[PDB]
Design a protein around this ligand. Structure first.
Ligand SMILES: C[C@]12CC[C@H]3[C@@H](CCC4=CC(=O)CC[C@@]43C)[C@@H]1CC[C@@H]2O
Ligand SMILES: C[C@]12CC[C@H]3[C@@H](CCC4=CC(=O)CC[C@@]43C)[C@@H]1CC[C@@H]2O
Length: 580
């Protein structure tokens, strides 16, 4: 019984190689493309040998042993990866655990900057090399990217270049195709990173809870046993992928996609479109499937979960199953709620039973349990209404700026690039979610907010700067967004010392693209808040407007630098007075 042969036979050579390339790229993010390709081929050649004869020497070793041994043969390991050479002394599974610790969530690699003429040539010159290069580039930038899903995006990446290279207009799919794919890559990466973060920081229990809530919303027709079945299998898939077991992850994901499609009539009417597709496409469509219509025979929950006299007995006899059933029943009923809200509601239900069942007369106590949920629902609904009201009034750029001020005040010790990133991400959430139908706003906003907050938390694990951020990031997954919302200006913070050069602009800003100009100004905005943390958002908006006007004027000037030189220092000095 050869594991590597077993995976090679199940997956096929193409997907086997793709996943192995991705896995290696994620583990060793600094190595060049050619180096990894060689290791992939070496591993694949061995798999073929084992497929021919599974009794052969070393074919019965574990995948982690074989792939771990392979990574440790890389040239200049100690120089390039000083930390990783230490892992190579260790044995499995200790070695892989060491490997996973050293994955870098922020490698700070160059921007993709597609060159359509050169890339279409390389694509035509060698497609396998070209598509493989793409897997490699994204994988090392996103060390926790969902392995099988990255192969799906490589196919979209192929279809773009296939359709557009022979066309007349050279860059007819630059902004249209690659920028859209780039956006989908970011969202997908953020979604999977949350799952891996949940395993790491809160355990498998938290991942299953989240998954029960989400899949109940998606598949309200399905029975609890069906959802539990799917959650169990899907949790194992993500567990394997998050721990670098990409071949096993891909294989189990295929098995799950098959199961769902075989039982689609009892699961969801929306799956039929997904289930008449190829493998990678089918799995992707299932994963992103639209929520099914609510069945007309949804049961009233007051009887079982509020009015039944033996709830304390049920709760005590099997807490997991009873609470699991509640979460399933309440979630399928509420596609208009965010997942974290449903998890908060489930925690409040649990807490109510813990309290009420210790008292003398539990029934009278827990009779009003559903009424405790109302304030939990109103708070996020109010936040989303306020944020969307602001977004629709001022637009994305100014909405981003308001969020940068908001979060810099909460966490002024965090780096400016990180504060700008989260502010800009949460601004795009406005564009994405506030235009949706009204019932879909809350789930879209809060679910995306969870992704952006996790990004901040993951960067904070690497570079801790604030005890308040640690607390919100590690105390409770469900309470994370309310914790961050509750943060106010850190009074313990001492204003960052003034540096004139930080707010000094030059003629180089004028040649930049619009998004890059914004980031420079938004970076200055974060720095303004850091030096003057008590300045109001209204003061800051005005001062930034003056900076924007100053940049606009001097970029339209005959002598651009002389304009920046004369005008800048006065404005820099005057701005500080405006922020008192
Ligand atoms: C997965 C895939 C087939 C297998 C390809 C993969 C691109 C990268 C690659 C390079 C190789 O040298 C082996 C085959 C693989 C792994 C392709 C991208 C789309 C296509 O379906
Ligand atoms: C997270 C949680 C404990 C673990 C529960 C979860 C409901 C769903 C569930 C079902 C299971 O089969 C395992 C335990 C879990 C994952 C509960 C909801 C609130 C409670 O705190």
């Amino acid at each position: 019984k050869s594991e590597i042969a077993h995976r090679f036979n199940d997956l096929g050579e193409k997907h086997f190689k793709g996943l192995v390339l991705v896995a290696f790229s994620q583990y060793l993010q600094q190595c060049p493309f050619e180096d990894h390709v060689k290791l992939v081929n070496e591993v694949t050649e061995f798999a073929k040998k084992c497929a021919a004869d599974e009794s052969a020497e070393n074919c019965d070793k574990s995948l982690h042993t074989l792939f771990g041994d392979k990574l440790c043969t890389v040239a200049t390991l100690r120089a390039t990866y000083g930390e990783l050479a230490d892992c190579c002394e260790k044995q499995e599974p200790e070695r892989n655990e060491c490997f996973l610790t050293h994955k870098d969530d922020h490698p700070n690699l160059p921007k993709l900057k597609p060159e359509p003429d050169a890339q279409c040539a390389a694509f035509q010159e060698d497609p396998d090399k070209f598509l493989g290069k793409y897997l490699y580039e994204v994988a090392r930038r996103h060390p926790y990217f969902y392995g099988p899903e990255l192969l799906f995006h490589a196919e979209e990446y192929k279809a773009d270049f296939t359709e557009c290279c022979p066309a007349d207009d050279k860059l007819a799919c630059l902004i249209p195709k690659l920028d859209a794919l780039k956006e989908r890559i970011l969202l997908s990466s953020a979604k999977e990173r949350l799952k891996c973060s949940s395993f790491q920081n809160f355990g498998e229990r938290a991942v299953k809870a989240w998954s029960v809530a989400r899949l109940s919303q998606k598949f309200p027709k399905a029975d609890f046993a069906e959802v539990s079945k799917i959650v169990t299998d899907l949790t194992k898939v993500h567990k394997e992928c998050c721990h670098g077991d990409l071949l096993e992850c891909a294989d189990d994901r295929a098995d799950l996609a098959k199961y769902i499609c075989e039982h689609q009539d009892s699961i969801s009417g929306k799956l039929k479109a997904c289930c008449d597709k190829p493998l990678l496409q089918k799995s992707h469509c299932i994963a992103e499937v639209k929520e099914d219509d609510l069945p007309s025979d949804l049961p009233a929950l007051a009887a079982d979960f509020a009015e039944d006299k033996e709830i304390c007995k049920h709760y005590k006899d099997a807490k997991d199953v009873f609470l699991g059933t509640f979460l399933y029943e309440y979630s399928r009923r509420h596609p208009d709620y965010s997942v974290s809200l449903l998890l908060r509601i489930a925690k409040t239900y649990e807490a109510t039973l813990e309290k009420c069942c210790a008292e003398a007369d539990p029934p009278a106590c827990y009779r009003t349990v559903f009424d405790q949920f109302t304030p939990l629902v109103e708070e996020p609904k109010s936040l989303v209404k306020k944020n969307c009201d602001l977004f629709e009034e001022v637009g994305e750029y100014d909405f981003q700026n308001a969020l940068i001020v908001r979060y810099t005040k909460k966490a002024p010790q965090v780096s400016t690039p990180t504060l700008v990133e989260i502010g800009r991400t949460l601004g795009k959430v406005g564009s994405r979610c506030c235009k949706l139908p009204e019932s879909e706003r809350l789930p879209c906003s809060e679910n995306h907010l969870a992704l952006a907050l996790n990004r901040l938390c993951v960067l904070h694990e690497k570079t801790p700067v604030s005890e308040k951020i640690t607390k919100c990031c590690t105390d409770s997954l469900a309470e994370r967004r309310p914790c961050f919302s509750a943060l106010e200006l850190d009074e313990g913070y001492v204003p960052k010392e003034f540096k004139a050069e930080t707010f000094t602009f030059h003629a180089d800003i004028c040649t930049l693209p619009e998004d890059e100009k914004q980031i420079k100004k938004q970076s200055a905005l974060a720095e303004l808040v850091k030096h003057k943390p008590k300045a109001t958002k209204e003061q800051l908006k005005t001062v930034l407007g003056n900076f924007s006007a100053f940049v606009a004027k001097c970029c339209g000037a005959e002598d651009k630098e002389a304009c920046f030189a004369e005008e800048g220092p006065k404005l820099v000095a005057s701005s500080q007075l405006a922020l008192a």
